[PDB]
Design a protein around this ligand. Sequence first.
Ligand code: SF4
Ligand code: SF4
Ligand code: FES
Ligand code: FES
Ligand code: FE
Ligand code: FE
Ligand code: FE
Ligand code: FE
Ligand code: FE
Ligand code: FE
Ligand code: FE
Ligand code: FE
Ligand code: FE
Ligand code: FE
Lengths: 633, 633
Amino acid sequence: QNLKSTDRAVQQMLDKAKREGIQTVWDRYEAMKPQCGFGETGLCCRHCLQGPCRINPFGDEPKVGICGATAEVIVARGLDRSIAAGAAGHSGHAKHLAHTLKKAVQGKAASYMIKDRTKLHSIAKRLGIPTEGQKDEDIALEVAKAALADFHEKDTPVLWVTTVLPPSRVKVLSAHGLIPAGIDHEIAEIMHRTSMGCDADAQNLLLGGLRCSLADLAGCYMGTDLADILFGTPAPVVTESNLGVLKADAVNVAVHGHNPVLSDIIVSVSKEMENEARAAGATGINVVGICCTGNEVLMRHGIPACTHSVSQEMAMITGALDAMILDYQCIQPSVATIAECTGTTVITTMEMSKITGATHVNFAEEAAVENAKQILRLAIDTFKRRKGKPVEIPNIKTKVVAGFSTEAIINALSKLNANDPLKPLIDNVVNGNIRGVCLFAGCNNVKVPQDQNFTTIARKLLKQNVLVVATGCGAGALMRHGFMDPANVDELCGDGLKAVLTAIGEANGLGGPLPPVLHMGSCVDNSRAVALVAALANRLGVDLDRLPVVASAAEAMHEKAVAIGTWAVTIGLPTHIGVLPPITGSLPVTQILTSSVKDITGGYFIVELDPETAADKLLAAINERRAGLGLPW
Amino acid sequence: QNLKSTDRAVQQMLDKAKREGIQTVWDRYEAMKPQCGFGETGLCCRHCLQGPCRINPFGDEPKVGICGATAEVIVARGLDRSIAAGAAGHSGHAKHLAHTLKKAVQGKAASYMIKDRTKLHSIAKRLGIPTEGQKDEDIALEVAKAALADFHEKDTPVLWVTTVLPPSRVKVLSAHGLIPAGIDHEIAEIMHRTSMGCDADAQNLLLGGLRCSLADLAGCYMGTDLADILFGTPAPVVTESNLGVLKADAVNVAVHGHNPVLSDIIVSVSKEMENEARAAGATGINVVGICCTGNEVLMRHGIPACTHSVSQEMAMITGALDAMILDYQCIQPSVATIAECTGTTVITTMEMSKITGATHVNFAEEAAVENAKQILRLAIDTFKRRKGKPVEIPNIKTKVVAGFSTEAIINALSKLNANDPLKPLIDNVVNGNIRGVCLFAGCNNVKVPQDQNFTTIARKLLKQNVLVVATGCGAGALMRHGFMDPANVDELCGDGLKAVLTAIGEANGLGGPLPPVLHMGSCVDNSRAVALVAALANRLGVDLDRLPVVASAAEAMHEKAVAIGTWAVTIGLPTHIGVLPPITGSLPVTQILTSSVKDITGGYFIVELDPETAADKLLAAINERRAGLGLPW
Ligand code: SF4
Ligand code: SF4
Ligand code: FES
Ligand code: FES
Ligand SMILES: [Fe+3]
Ligand SMILES: [Fe+3]
Ligand SMILES: [Fe+3]
Ligand SMILES: [Fe+3]
Ligand SMILES: [Fe+3]
Ligand SMILES: [Fe+3]
Ligand SMILES: [Fe+3]
Ligand SMILES: [Fe+3]
Ligand SMILES: [Fe+3]
Ligand SMILES: [Fe+3]
């Protein structure tokens, strides 16, 4: 089972699933092998009913699609649609939060409110919205209107791009025509240009993809901005992760998906139902996280994270998961059938994401508290039904220090230099105590033993004094393996990094270092890493493609991960991806994405499936940036 | 070659291509066989980097995707993305025309103007825009603003749906949640809901598809509305079709693509360059049409149609095609490589649709006349370079009577009943001289001998007194086979239909009947058929699902054709498709689309690849509607 997952709790549940005959994601993967090589390389097209068209990577015919589409075109069109799909997900999440904010301040949903007034005013100021003499509710209405306006064409470009990157970066992108005109506008233009008989030039297609990836970035940044207004900006928090956070004697409720608009409410209501939970024989309601909705409630409230990504079904295999409350994205639909064998109540809540066989509760912000109580009552009913049933919760968990929003990081550094908080970080980059910054992002993927690339790469970088930040299921992988426990700093960190983590920690009262890796939140909260890197760029007077900052989607899966990787490249970062995207069928497309894009945006993809080699390549990319700044490395 | 195309001119060019060694679409199809059965049935997913996933139609594993996605989910997600892509194309075309109109009336592009003031005011009235006391330019600005506003969420739903269907139909659709909230909003929500780990219920997915198909309808109707304001509403016109419309002694310039914003200008400028063409040794500039941009200029100006769809490369094989001027959609990218062997100058004009190896001219409405002259000068240069080269233009052409906009049809019928123009049509439906109405729409497809299904089905329906209307490449197929020549009415039409076509023709001065089939325009102008059918519905006080009206996408190919077929179903029509969409891998999805959707919208798909059988099925659908109205059949 260590060939399926490096997580010992997951391995234990894989053994239980095997003896109980419950099929898992790894079993379904095995049943899919050998997978189609045309699809894996990108050399398949189904964009019209003359297809499917395939092209042999090598050899004889077919060499070209029926309409004449070349391998270059086919691969670039497929990739562009994946970017658009990812942008559609992140920006659908942001759009939902925009409507939620508008409702809150129009007095239509009093379960929601402006919790972070400081963040509201700073976002308003960034967008050019006047705050002097205005009611907070009016400023917020303007912010939510601006958010909605970035989805369509208007007299300005997408402000959640142009106001969040350095002017010099905006200028470079504008010169190449890459600034998005509107988020849903770009998604639709991708779907148009990639349909049959339209764009058929790889460079032109890929430029469109880069622009659509910035629409994804805008959705991510908008989502983080709106969620912080509504739910609070994260600050350091201490919690736990892995399946041992489930408690046999409690009602275990997982929040799973991406958008916390309902699961933030679940967290609140669950505490006010502690006595109703007790009347049913439980100690309490134990809300736990899965995937990014879990990250959201971890970062804001310290809710423990049960599991992530590819291993999500394992939480149900314990027998102790009374409810799984779903919104959208990255939810394996197998959960609805597994639930019949495990006793879990799987509940969908969003109209555009239902799963056959799950119970649907139509969540409305207007009714959030009532809907939450209905859902938790189902979970309580379920707890009662498992009276007397043995459960097998692996007694395995890690300590997690998290909550490192960009504001939190700036505040932590400000204890070393109150009026120039970024300077202590920069000083330690210059002197080499911090070699550079690496962001780990993205999913797990069944093709890769779970977490093996995140942990292997992170260990090498941390020994070389790289400041490692993480989001999403990359943060999930690292937290489940102890990378967010400060007790592991001596083992994992080089001496320079340890010194910096210790100096900042001790200056923040902790009598101990910051954790080895800083958890910056959910996938949309990759936008927080952008905010940090852009602030560093501003403070140094250079663009992001001169900073010693890299990204790694070390185990990517979702179309959203492709979008994030592409915008990381577009904003100027060397960007590692540790699974193969469907590009190898076209050398010209591969060469653009891994090399000639450098001449457009300064960033580039590093495709490398061997994680030791990827770490070396990421270090070389960091060290090249250091050399370009005239720094030792 | 009659196994490739039923068009004799195409067959002649296929022989020339074969002896010259020029590969065609049919050759590329042959090289693709056998095609992938997983893709053909819909049982392939590439929505995440754990794929590709395939499901065996029958037999053993794989039975489910890696994430747990069932065959039902996989098939419904694929279909929904095709609908979204089609909506993206039709509504990208409409959006372009909206911006063109706005520019025209803001004084930014004086090559464009309000040509149809009556249509402008009627559209304004339909949308609720005041016209009394307003400058036309201000009414138009309001109409273009409204057009742009339908792309995004706002306080009203998409007006180019809710104001163009009967209230009773709007009510049925609203009750099922099917009215789109915004065109690009729906496209993005489809891309989101279909991404990994989101919507996983076939009925829910398909309802989303139906709603997105109405966003496609809105784009089509918007496109026709805006093009009529700018370029004029079609009225009856007489021209010719097929390759014999090329002239060896002239500069032959094909306009090809969909959006006529530039090719309407090409038509104008070409006439003012007749003397510059003569100085170069030509008789003149002979503008000819391909595909739907060709239909647009045929309907408005009588420009002859050279060819359509699958046979587009054959126009180049003649050796006499000096330029091919491209916008977007349905352009085989092979044209750019064929042009090196045929001497044709292939010119792209739109930023989001380039083809490697073609010459790009950046068209701007602000510069339309200048850009057109640059392009035509290239075509003239090309004509000169073929001084002395033999050409082989098949001496094959048909006479085409076209220009039957809905306004034109109403006007024609008004000569039989001035103040109740629809009543003569209804009277003849009731008495059986007109059995019903069939709309032929969509593309040719290399899988089907070109035009064989359109002509086979149309012949059977016309003998059974069906009034046949046609758009797009369905109109192209029928025009190239003589179905738009009134001289063929005696051979093709039943006695009842002949009597009606003759009565209307003779009442319009023609001393002869209307043609056997009425050409209602381009693919967006499927919206004109909706306008006609909705007006009939209004006049009878029933909804469209009670009218004896059917649709047939008899040879479909493009994602746009899937969108049109789906909205034809959604508005209440029995809708034949004569190629297999990728649905047969899921019986539940097939059953929804061909049967249980009847209980939602009253329409349904009829999937039938044998064209004689399809005609019988379409007649049975018409006759069932007649029976439901208590009429003989
Ligand atoms: S778009 Fe071209 S390559 Fe794709 S399926 Fe259609 S014919 Fe084949
Ligand atoms: S979304 Fe599911 S079915 Fe599709 S490729 Fe990914 S794992 Fe396979
Ligand atoms: S041929 Fe396998 S992915 Fe299309
Ligand atoms: S396996 Fe052939 S279309 Fe994917
Ligand atoms: Fe995910
Ligand atoms: Fe993610
Ligand atoms: Fe992910
Ligand atoms: Fe993630
Ligand atoms: Fe994830
Ligand atoms: Fe077409
Ligand atoms: Fe069409
Ligand atoms: Fe078509
Ligand atoms: Fe067509
Ligand atoms: Fe066509």
